[PDB]
């Protein structure tokens, strides 16, 4: 699954207007809250790719789940991602990276990363909104720091007093080999880009 990401800084000074705008020109909003976790590989010698993206990223929707519970850490639904690097010297047109949406269901969840020998690493909470557009979808970011490690009790800690809202257009190609589907996708994202360039400044960014 080759995702076609986009990025767009939103100053918080003007953020509400962007919301009132997008709500009147796009599907949704759908509420977004999620709790990332990264569990670190720790092996030597190379060749370990040991890349900053190579570190694994488990994901979990947490919004519907109530804040009071503390056993959410396993009882909650979970998933796993890789997200490889974007293809080199990719400008004008959106950057493109491989992504794999793994899922799993058992009482044993987190433990498995230790079963792979992986251990706890950096983590952060995301909050924002998603907007549908047929296949393509745009999600807006807020990377709140949890009040405690693996805790779901507000307030959560902002990186700074004025955290930018990180707009993120994307779509999920079923497979890279199909330049036809690539064409339809690049087309859809192009139309989205035109659709919201009037009040925002998206651009390709290397990853």
């Amino acid at each position: 699954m080759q995702e076609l990401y986009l990025l767009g800084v939103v100053p918080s000074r003007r953020f509400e207007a962007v919301v009132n705008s997008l709500s009147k020109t796009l599907d949704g909003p759908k509420t977004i809250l999620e709790f990332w976790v990264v569990y670190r590989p720790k092996d030597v010698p190379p060749n370990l790719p040991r890349q900053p993206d190579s570190w694994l990223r488990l994901c979990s929707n947490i919004e519907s789940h109530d804040e009071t519970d503390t056993e959410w850490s396993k009882n909650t639904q979970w998933s796993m991602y890789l997200e490889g690097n974007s293809e080199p010297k990719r400008e004008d047109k959106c950057g493109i990276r491989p992504v794999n949406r793994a899922k799993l269901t058992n009482g044993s969840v987190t433990e498995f990363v230790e079963k792979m020998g992986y251990e706890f690493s950096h983590e952060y909470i995301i909050q924002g909104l998603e907007y549908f557009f047929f296949d393509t979808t745009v999600r807006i970011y807020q990377t709140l720091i949890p009040s405690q490690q693996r805790s779901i009790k507000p307030p959560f800690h902002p990186m700074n007093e004025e955290q930018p809202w990180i707009l993120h257009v994307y779509t999920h190609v079923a497979d890279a080999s199909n330049q036809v589907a690539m064409a339809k996708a690049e087309a859809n994202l192009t139309k989205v880009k035109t659709l919201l360039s009037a009040f925002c400044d998206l651009k390709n960014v290397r990853l």
Partner: protein
């Protein structure tokens, strides 16, 4: 009679630091580095 704001130009500097701040936060999501 009178006849015809750099601060508005400075707004671009605001966008600039906001952009570097975006680089910072993406580096965070990549690594957790602050």
């Amino acid at each position: 009679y009178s006849w015809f704001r750099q601060l508005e130009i400075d707004r671009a500097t605001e966008e600039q630091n906001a952009n570097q701040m975006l680089t910072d936060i993406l580096s965070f999501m990549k690594s957790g580095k602050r």
